[PDB]
């Protein structure tokens, strides 16, 4: 049996051969929106993952959030103390894979220092503030004792501690905030240690400041111990982020979230996974078709078309 018009497919021994009926195997178009089911999507409005992690004021809505996919918009910006994350990609990757911002406040005993330091560049409410998940320790009175504190991990989940080192701009500011001429920070565990020597130097003017914060992280495995030993320039943690394992991930996309059902999410939106191959994007999340370079692949579903 034959049909009037036919579709041209390609075989081992033929560039083009006409057949009665042929289907497409490459999903090359996207709906343009991200379905919010079944995957727990978290739309990050104006907030990058690290900003919500640290506790940027305009990100206070993201506290204790959880997600199956964190969509990070291109309009996101930082509006707090100018910070800098050495190995930013690794921290972002592991935080995103953990899949929760659940922050447990721990009781740290800082003796002889002024806690809750703040700045005018990070304005919380009407007054000066700081990152909600960090604690800026400054000299109390006229001394800055060598802080030496510890926290044991007695639970059976990893703990993620986010701390930082404050690089001042001028030596006067260094000695005004921390009486030592050049302090250092050392966060260590049983298996590894990490020491930072803060430097003093002017930096490009960002949000009214020349000083910076360097953000580091330390993962305390179960049964391990954290020891923080510093004599200046320490941005102490306030607690720990509960690390996890799961199917969580992060994605950079400006697609709007929509109320629908779909399993495969690309930055171009949710796409159906009926077809085995897709050409939309090479970044995928969920049960997605395999990305291919071709924009069309015709599978013959009928007999050779001889009309």
């Amino acid at each position: 049996h034959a049909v009037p018009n036919g579709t041209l497919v390609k075989t081992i021994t033929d560039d083009q051969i006409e057949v009665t009926n042929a289907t497409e195997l490459v999903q090359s178009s996207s709906t343009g929106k991200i379905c919010n089911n079944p995957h727990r999507i978290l739309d990050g409005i104006d907030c990058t993952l690290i900003d919500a992690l640290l506790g940027d004021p305009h990100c206070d809505v993201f506290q204790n959030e959880t997600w199956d996919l964190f969509v990070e918009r291109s309009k996101a910006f930082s509006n707090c103390y100018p910070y800098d994350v050495p190995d930013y990609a690794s921290l972002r990757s592991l935080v995103a894979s953990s899949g929760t911002l659940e922050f447990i406040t721990e009781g740290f005993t800082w003796t002889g220092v002024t806690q809750n330091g703040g700045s005018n560049a990070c304005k919380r409410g009407p007054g000066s503030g700081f990152f909600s998940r960090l604690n800026w320790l400054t000299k109390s009175g006229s001394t800055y004792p060598v802080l030496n504190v510890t926290m044991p991990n007695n639970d059976n989940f990893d703990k993620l501690y986010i701390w930082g080192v404050h690089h001042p701009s001028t030596n006067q500011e260094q000695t005004s905030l921390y009486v030592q001429a050049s302090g250092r920070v050392t966060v260590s565990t049983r298996r590894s240690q990490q020491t930072i020597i803060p430097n003093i130097g002017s930096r490009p003017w960002v949000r009214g400041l020349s000083s910076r914060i360097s953000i580091y992280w330390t993962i305390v495995k179960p049964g391990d111990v954290l020891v923080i030993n510093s004599n200046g320039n320490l941005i102490a943690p306030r607690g720990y982020f509960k690390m996890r394992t799961g199917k969580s991930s992060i994605m950079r996309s400006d697609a709007p979230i929509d109320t629908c059902i779909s399993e495969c999410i690309t930055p171009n939106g949710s796409i159906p996974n009926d077809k085995p191959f897709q050409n939309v994007n090479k970044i995928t999340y969920g049960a997605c078709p395999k990305y291919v370079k071709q924009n069309t692949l015709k599978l013959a579903t009928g007999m050779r078309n001889v009309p």
Partner: antibody
Amino acid sequence: QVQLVQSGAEVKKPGASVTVSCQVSGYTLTSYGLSWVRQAPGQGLEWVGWINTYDGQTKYVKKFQGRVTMTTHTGTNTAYMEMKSLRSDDTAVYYCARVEGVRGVMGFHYYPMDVWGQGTMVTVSS
Amino acid sequence: SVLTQPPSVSGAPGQRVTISCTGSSAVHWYQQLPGTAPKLLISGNSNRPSGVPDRFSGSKSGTSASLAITGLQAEDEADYYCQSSVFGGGTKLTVLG
């Protein structure tokens, strides 16, 4: 504060080419796409085009294909729209407006033009 | 995707105003004060942006969106456009004595 400051008024002659610039302030230009909208005097708004900063892919109306070019100077956070082969009908106010989506989607499909410049009065006639 | 809407609505200050755009296919509502850049006042289809007083409201039926202005006054009177890319024909808002 998010602000868009456009060039001064331009007075041209038919068949020439004009270049309108839009200086952004208060945000990074590559974070937002930028649409260009014209308004002939008392003729209501007419969408001209859309530049996707951060990847440079453009989209113009068929009426303006070829004779309009949009580029983005990222160093100065500036965006330029040049019109070649000006006609008399192109006398209008031109506005640059900020649109949200640059990565994954074409912004103007799903997002509005939340911030507008003051617009420049390009008059090609006498 | 032609857009249509009922033009030249005249009213005194302080009552209801309704404008109806019938998209034939996200419609957003912009306001152009005389001699001023247009201003966004309805995002999405019924959402309002920052700085827009809650007097403005949007309502979407199957394929017709409608913008309602409540208790209007001088600054609420301008030209109004619906956008979906294609713009609307424009409806003028004028005070009445």
